[PDB]
Design an enzyme around this catalytic site. Structure first.
Site, PDB file in Angstrom:
ATOM      1  N   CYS A 196       3.476   5.479   5.482  1.00  0.00           N
ATOM      2  CA  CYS A 196       3.632   4.268   6.270  1.00  0.00           C
ATOM      3  C   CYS A 196       5.096   3.857   6.311  1.00  0.00           C
ATOM      4  O   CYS A 196       5.827   4.035   5.336  1.00  0.00           O
ATOM      5  CB  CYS A 196       2.786   3.140   5.687  1.00  0.00           C
ATOM      6  SG  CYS A 196       2.832   1.611   6.624  1.00  0.00           S
ATOM      7  N   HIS A 210       0.830  -1.190   0.000  1.00  0.00           N
ATOM      8  CA  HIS A 210       0.000   0.000   0.000  1.00  0.00           C
ATOM      9  C   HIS A 210       0.868   1.245   0.000  1.00  0.00           C
ATOM     10  O   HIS A 210       2.067   1.213   0.307  1.00  0.00           O
ATOM     11  CB  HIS A 210      -1.011  -0.009   1.169  1.00  0.00           C
ATOM     12  CG  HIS A 210      -0.442   0.410   2.490  1.00  0.00           C
ATOM     13  ND1 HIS A 210      -1.121   1.224   3.366  1.00  0.00           N
ATOM     14  CD2 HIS A 210       0.724   0.089   3.100  1.00  0.00           C
ATOM     15  CE1 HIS A 210      -0.393   1.398   4.455  1.00  0.00           C
ATOM     16  NE2 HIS A 210       0.730   0.720   4.318  1.00  0.00           N
ATOM     17  N   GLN A 240      -7.169  -2.846   9.618  1.00  0.00           N
ATOM     18  CA  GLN A 240      -8.355  -2.016   9.751  1.00  0.00           C
ATOM     19  C   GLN A 240      -9.385  -2.474   8.726  1.00  0.00           C
ATOM     20  O   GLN A 240      -9.035  -2.845   7.601  1.00  0.00           O
ATOM     21  CB  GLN A 240      -7.988  -0.548   9.559  1.00  0.00           C
ATOM     22  CG  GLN A 240      -7.083  -0.019  10.663  1.00  0.00           C
ATOM     23  CD  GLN A 240      -6.999   1.498  10.683  1.00  0.00           C
ATOM     24  OE1 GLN A 240      -5.908   2.062  10.648  1.00  0.00           O
ATOM     25  NE2 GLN A 240      -8.148   2.164  10.708  1.00  0.00           N
TER      26      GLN A 240
END
Ligand SMILES: Cc1csc(C(N)=O)c1
Ligand SMILES: Cc1csc(C(N)=O)c1
EC number: 5.2.1.8
Length: 147
Positions: free
Chosen positions: A97, A43, A115
């Site tokens: 991140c 991601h 999440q």
């Protein structure tokens, strides 16, 4: 009719039908192709001032608004889709991140670990597929399913 999450929509600017996935926020002209214990995803995260921690390795104090974060995400998706940039390159340079140092790779995970909007999008992607903007408490994500 279509794989999980997919629906037909109408291009406002062109009038041509396209396909939108309401779990992954992916959108594409082409009809979507055709669940596992685990998926592997990378991601690219863009944090904003409402992130659950507005701080990253890129920035001690993240101050950009959610709307500004979405515009950055939108632009990264455009460069990935046009081939101007690779996902991995943008993640290494711009993901908020710490997984940026691994070109955004999070490794493999099960349901009930990430999440929930991230999990749902990750599991709705087919291998090789990329999400649109996915919202969590961390920020806004582009997710690439690699396995
Ligand atoms: C376009 C848009 C994305 S987030 C947002 C807001 N007001 O937080 C607006
Ligand atoms: C999945 C992952 C790779 S590097 C990293 C970190 N350094 O926090 C996360």
């Amino acid at each position: 009719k279509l794989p999980p999450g997919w629906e037909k929509a109408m291009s406002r600017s062109s009038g041509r039908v396209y396909y939108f996935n309401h779990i992954t926020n992916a959108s594409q002209w082409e009809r979507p192709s055709g669940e596992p214990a685990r998926v592997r995803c990378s991601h690219l995260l863009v944090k904003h001032s409402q992130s659950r921690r507005p701080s990253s390795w890129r920035q001690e104090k993240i101050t950009r608004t959610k709307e500004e974060a979405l515009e950055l995400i939108n632009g990264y998706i455009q460069k990935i889709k046009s081939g101007e940039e690779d996902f991995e390159s943008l993640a290494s340079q711009f993901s908020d991140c710490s997984s940026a140092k691994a070109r955004g790779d999070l490794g493999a995970f099960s349901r009930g670990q990430m999440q929930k909007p991230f999990e749902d999008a990750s599991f709705a992607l087919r291998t090789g597929e990329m999400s649109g903007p996915v919202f969590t408490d961390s920020g806004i994500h582009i997710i690439l399913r690699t396995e």
